[PDB]
């Protein structure tokens, strides 16, 4: 084994379904290994120092990302607006590619696509040329969408809905009756923009930075009741202390080249961006964009 980052799979030869399970591994010249891997349900996990796996979002929580901020890292957004007692959607026409309309795509009096037809590159071109950026949709279409952020009833301070909650008509009603006429949701599908990180959050037992740090600490140090300082320092010393971790120059060069970065020089320790970029490349591979080493 040599220092760098490595993207691999199991060649569909682990479970009966023959599902290909992808993984990524960061190997330093010295210090702890860091592994990311998919399970058969397409949830993502992290292994620190080769021990038992944890829902991958834990490491991002430990690096001070909220649920909302994690979703910002891994998903584009589809905005809905409530106006004229109608549900409207902000349209980026290219997002319609490969889909079949479930309702009349219409704007400015004109009907661009019928409720049955398959959406064409021509449809998309005309929509772009006419600068259609907003279309009415049925309320039913909001169902199953995933809300991208926390929404608060500002008159009471009550959390009306938490980031990553699935939308329903009842929730839409609550939001609307609380004065929220603009609602942000995740752009996903079941094909090449999978909701892996969103579903991973649902099996993540932690909910903030301290609980994530404690989950990691308990995993690394069985039998040691955790303290604040202990959990903080252990995490800092895994990947972010020159004393305890070094990718080495060779490792950094190979790491950066795998991520298609221009620079060859870099740090012996890891950054937040290093870790997130490795996660993003692994997710690309699962989504069919690019391939393993």
């Amino acid at each position: 084994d040599s220092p760098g980052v490595f993207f691999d799979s199991d060649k569909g030869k682990t479970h009966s379904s023959g599902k290909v399970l992808y993984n990524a591994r960061i190997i330093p010249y010295r210090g702890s290994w860091l592994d990311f891997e998919f399970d058969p349900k397409d949830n993502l996990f992290v292994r620190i120092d080769r021990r038992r796996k944890l829902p991958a979002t834990i490491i991002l929580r430990a690096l001070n990302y909220t649920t909302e901020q994690i979703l910002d890292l891994f998903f584009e957004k589809v905005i809905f607006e409530i106006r004229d007692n109608k549900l409207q959607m902000e349209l980026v026409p290219e997002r319609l590619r490969g889909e079949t309309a479930s309702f009349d795509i219409e704007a400015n009096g004109k009907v661009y696509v019928e409720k049955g037809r398959r959406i064409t590159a021509r449809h998309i071109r005309q929509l772009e040329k006419d600068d259609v950026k907003l279309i009415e949709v049925p309320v039913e279409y909001i169902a199953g969408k995933v809300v991208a952020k926390d929404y608060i009833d500002e008159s009471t301070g009550e959390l009306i809905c938490a980031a990553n909650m699935e939308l329903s008509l009842d929730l839409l009603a609550k939001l609307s009756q609380s004065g929220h006429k603009r609602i942000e949701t995740l752009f996903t599908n079941d094909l090449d923009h999978g909701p892996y990180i969103s579903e991973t959050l649902r099996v993540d037992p932690t909910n903030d930075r301290l609980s994530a740090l404690v989950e990691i600490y308990r995993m690394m140090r069985p039998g040691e009741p955790p303290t604040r300082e202990a959990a903080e320092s252990l995490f800092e010393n895994l990947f972010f202390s020159e004393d305890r971790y070094d990718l080495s120059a060779v490792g950094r060069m190979k790491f950066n080249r795998s991520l298609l970065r221009e620079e060859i020089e870099g740090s012996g320790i890891l950054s937040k961006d290093d870790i997130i970029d490795v996660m993003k490349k692994l997710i690309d591979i699962r989504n069919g964009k690019g391939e393993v080493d």
Binding site: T156, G157, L159, A162, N207, L210
Partner: protein, 55 residues
Amino acid sequence: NDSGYKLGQRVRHAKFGEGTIVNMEGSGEHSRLQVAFQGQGIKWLVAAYARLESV
């Protein structure tokens, strides 16, 4: 939590009435409080947005 509130604390809300803090999450402007209100059930409040008075 560095938010000003403590687990077990009795609080008063203008709409929800008297309650007890039963859990907390997050930090900074993101700190949130799980409050059991006597006659109105359990609610999550974002500390920075909720008017609470310490009973």
